[PDB]
């Protein structure tokens, strides 16, 4: 003899029934937002401007000291110094500067000492920063940035393979010298180390009795030292970079290994610049307030700058809660607030004077034809 | 394929027992019965999928940059492992497509694992007077278990009632004499009536199940010769009395197709002839194409535009190297130009991030799973929700402008009934329609009142009939009659003439029928009724309910029980309904004084032509005629009844002329037609019956919504033209004042336009386009018809036959003229259309006037246009399971589409239209920043950001908000979108997304990147020491991280602002994305593997200057676009914000989220 569920899930999320708040672009609820944003940000921009014009700074350009100075104190050409002081807006007070030659050194391209005497009509509120600024010196090229090896930072005895045949981050051009001694500082970053001997003190002019001394130690993050350790090489396979021979005619002997841990300035130079203008911290002061008066600084010139038409100078600043002194933030805040207010007012006047009905149920597309 | 070389298969000629080869013929090429409805072959799937994915232009350039990235001799470091994102995206695409194909294959397997049985137990020749009564049948014959997997040419199959057809079939033996079986071709066409199929005349005498295996013969049959209704076979057999071979030819009429089903036959054995692709459904099916989305084409156009941007940028960026490279300054230590360009292009490698296609497929899969899980589309009547089969197509729905439907299961179910009748100009029965909407806004209250009145009338009709007497088989499941006056006019309160007329009308309603009465196999008490036609079954059920039950088919007469008393009539002759006659008649005899009675049911035109107009009272006929005309112009389909009385001599000479003319041989058709004409020229009409077909739930309102939303729809019909016409009038599609521009090729018009159909249709189209409306012309007309994108105008209707449409579609001039005519019209109906014809016309309408269409339908015939419409949707359920094989989507019933396509389509069409600008903004903001930074360092090719950023940013930081905006966006509420579907006009006019919009966002991104770079750079430029402590900065990576944080927060805020639905979900992910950005930066810099930074968190997030620059960047990223949008809102107010404001004001407040079409009782005021 012959003989011949699947209910879907019902949840709030499954049916897309979540608590929603549809935004509304009606003027009566968005104009207050415009007004409050405009006023709050224009007043904070004004506060930024006020906190920005409260710091003084001085820049002195001495990249051409030998060709323009004499053995006596001479006035600084106008294109080599720029002052900002909130106390005095017309404080020109052209300082003086001179150069003295040293015959003990044979590097005729860059040798000697440049002395700058300058006046200060204000005081530095227990915070002094002396920096070296550079221009027309490209320090961000692709191979230049990578021209170093992180393995040497830990102090391990890297081999030629580990420094030249490594991954994309290695010192390619200056891995090895002519004889075959591996560089402990390898690459262009360490080879382009600067040769401007900055003093550890300030030579006062008015009060030569108690003239103040600076301190370049501790100018980097304390925790960051935990990554940089002492060299652990065999004091025989290490040679200085070819541009470092002036500091070591023989090289590294048994008692001259440069401890990276306490060398903050070299580590600071290991942070290559990004733009055409480059400056790093080299002198810091937080012990005592710097008083007003005349001050003299002596700088040793061994690092060539003019051979590539570059420029160098010194930059002294008290510092501020907004870093260096710059009015650009105040300008953009002010212009943003002003343009927001102007746009709000102009949209209001079109909406009122030349404005139609707020909403019509018969103005839609199908309602003409 | 195979056309000639007919296959000769033996039967009842056993092979020798000592050696067998399990066949009677040598080996030949054998198409397998397995039906492959999937996309790609599982064995050969990878190359097809890759080549389909290879057709884009972004993945190929990713592949070449990974390949050429290593071919450069010491130019860039060897990738080694920097190639896995391409691998993972291609394998995840392959896995998704493989899961889709796995679902298709498991569906095919569960279809093909049905049940079939073939007899065995005795020695078979293949696999283990005329009639004599000497051999006793062997009791070993039992039905075995068989599957559709192993059926092939050379096999016999036994099929019973309520079973489908395994393949193309030849009728051998049926349950009755003469071998006549009844089949529905519903999957092939939407005909209502059963289809008659006669078996072989040689096997019309065998009765017992063993007598089918008592004669020896052989079969000569040809293969599929690529035809639809043509077949030639030869059955040859040897006689036992004399030695000779006698043959019989077999035409198409004996051939049974595949996509059919057997009704009203207990058992039938047949011979398998065609297997596999030989079936007509496989011929008309197609190849189930890739079904590739439209938006991806212009997405690839945008991608190649970005490639051109990269090429033009690096063609002027790399040229600066040479004016400084060969010049001063230098204190560091052609082919060089080419390597500089190469390093620049590998630097700017993220203008088009790889995440594009993976994000697109993730969004599409999320949309598909949400569509699947949507409970508002669940069809609880048969436990099947809306299932998206192909998940690649979930974005094309927004541009749906044209709708193509069928009659098999789309517009209506397979049920009809009786509602109204005219007896002597008196109406009986009442229904509910919307025909009073416009004869002179409040129509819902009247509709509800009428529905309540109909319900009350039906209830009281049922009550009166159960109370006045106890009918034997009275059940309310088929009582569709409403009018109660029938009882008191039968009681005798309606005079004598009207009483007799209504009594005879009711009697004739229960006599003219081709139905056979059979007892129910479940309960003998309540016998079931199985008719040769659905309208006949409905009429028989109504007659059973009204107390004139028809039981039994005696040798001379039929049993009729009136109210309980049973009597047998005396039927004399029956003339069956003919497709060309449009009339079916019966001749019976009543013993008094005996008298012959003729009653014929037919079409209105034929009934009115066959009448006695030469003498009459000029009142009854005129009132009946006016009732007929009013029903026709309301849109009712009806039949008419004509009787006549004959004396003894009249009956005698009628039967004499019948026996001498129609009972003859040699083409008795003309003689029978002449006899019927001469006997029915004189007739007396007695009234008319009206058949009514029930459509799907919510068809008229759905059609109205689609029409008012700008989506002008079409309906393509099958069986007959009058069926489609009355269906259209019943629905709210065809209006009475609407002009019917009927287009027929072989109608009665020919007597004044006789020529070939080409010239006939040319003259018709010229007289249409010159007289009523002047737009004659082709090229200029097409140019003007390109630029409308949908508008309902013209208020006319066109009806076209299959031959007319094919002769207008063959030629290109005819095609464009028909396209112009159909664009001018709004009610295009196509009838007698073959699957190939409708596929060709849908291809033409898709190509010319490029518009994205839909082919909703049901059956095995509509696939031809389904696979053409580029969006696949079909009616699933117990009624149709064959179109859903190829359809992209498969609905429970048509009532879902009218919401789905009207809501989700638009939704996604906007969601993606917003996601694409966000995705091509989030990469420009990252890449043009590097480009701008390059101007310092002079395009040397130095990274500004961390090496891990270029691979981790687009994958973790700014990816989540864009994806969430694309997926969980809600432009408007579903209820409000359904209430006002005019919003769909934006998808109709495609103004939302285009090249101008792309250029606007590209300029905005360029401006954004300009700001995002120039702000921190100008903040630094004075001193390089803006950090509140000096102590060391200036490194390229720190300015890079500042600008990347600015860019990512700007992108997140911009996505949040552009999002139309601010919920606790998208905002939560935006906040967590910002938090994870900060946390990952901190945790990466506070680790041993932080080689360069080692201090990023302390260097970045401890500095008020960083917060100030972030805030000012937020200002300058938000204000410009915000104010432009605010200005545009007043300048060119898009309808979206106006409807949103109206919604929020409270207009649509009392309306609940759960919209229901069956609730017109909303208290508006
Ligand atoms: C290698 O060992 C060296 C001996 O310790 C030393 O290099 C330099 O050796 C000279 C030889 O006496 C020292 O003296 C020089 O400087 C003094 C002034 O301090 C002069 O009076 C001497 O005449 C002579 O010019 C140097 O002081 C010494 N260099 C340093 C930096 O101390 C180093 O220890 C080793 N080499 C290096 C490069 O450090
Ligand atoms: C002496 C002059 C001619 C050159 C030196 C001045 C430098 C600092 C200025 C002057 C002209 C400037 C260029 C003007 C045009 C362009 C093209 C632009 O798409 C990238 C920036 C770039 C390349 C500028 C770079 C800086 C530039 C070269
Ligand atoms: C070199 C010249 C010819 C290039 C064309 C520049 C001018 C004509 C185009 C480029 C950008 C355009 C502006 C883009 C944005 C807006 C803001 C809108 O609210 C008013 C129109 C306005 C102000 C357009 C005015 C015309 C415009 C300034
Ligand atoms: C933090 C600290 O105490 N540093 C001192 C330093 O001031 C001193 O000059 C030096 C003498 O060798 O010894 C160090 O330990
Ligand atoms: C150096 O500068 C001084 C001061 O202006 C000037 O007089 C002198 O000519 C300069 N020397 C040059 C240009 O060689
Ligand atoms: C202070 O000035 C005197 C001038 O004779 C100089 O010798 C001394 O070195 C100066 N102080 C310091 C700390 O150098
Ligand atoms: C003064 O400066 C020295 C420089 O080494 C430092 O060690 C000391 O702590 C400072 N004194 C105070 C009170 O800060
Ligand atoms: F159902 Al058809 F042509 F057969 F529309
Ligand atoms: Mg219908």
Numbering used by the authors:
A (entry chain B): 41 to 44, 50 to 414
B (entry chain A): 200 to 327, 424 to 628, 640 to 746, 751 to 902, 908 to 1480
Task: Show passages lifted from the paper.
P4 ATPases are involved in phospholipid translocation: they flip lipids from the extracellular side of the plasma membrane or from the lumenal side of internal organelles to the cytosolic side. Most P4 ATPases function as a heterodimeric complex: a catalytic α-subunit containing 10 transmembrane α-helices (TMHs) and a regulatory β-subunit of the Cdc50 (cell division cycle 50) protein family containing two TMHs. Dnf1 and Dnf2 share the same β-subunit, Lem3, and both are also capable of transporting PE and GlcCer. Here, we report the cryo-EM structures of Dnf1–Lem3 in three different states (E1, E1P-ADP, and E2P) and Dnf2–Lem3 in five different states (E1, E1-ATP, E1P-ADP, E2P, and E2P-transition).
